């Protein structure tokens, strides 16, 4: 709806595909702990639906 879902940064190892996919605005640079991760994280569509 309003989130940025593709992004561009410094070049990837393969020059023909330099896109990062971002569902729900989540950044994939960091590792996650599945037990307690999304405690206080929301995005626009989910909040509007609620």
């Amino acid at each position: 709806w309003a989130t940025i879902d593709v992004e561009y940064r410094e070049p990837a190892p393969y020059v023909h595909a330099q896109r990062y996919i971002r569902y729900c605005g989540i950044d994939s640079r960091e590792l996650i702990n599945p037990t307690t991760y999304g405690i206080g994280m929301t995005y626009h569509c989910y909040n509007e639906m609620l």
Binding site: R9, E10, R29, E30, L31, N33, T35, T36, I39
Partner: protein, 50 residues
């Protein structure tokens, strides 16, 4: 060290990423501490003893 710093099994804190894709190029904490000084540089030896 980058992977260890980004792994958060407790309450998450604010993080700001830098323009470059090099490791340890970000600022962390409520007091933004520059982590770029811990990357190795053999001409001056910033990240280690000495």
């Amino acid at each position: 060290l980058n992977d260890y710093l980004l792994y958060m099994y407790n309450t998450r804190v604010q993080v700001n990423y830098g323009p470059t894709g090099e490791p340890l190029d970000f600022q962390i904490g409520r007091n933004q501490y520059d982590c770029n000084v811990f990357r190795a540089d053999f001409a001056t030896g910033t990240g280690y003893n000495g």
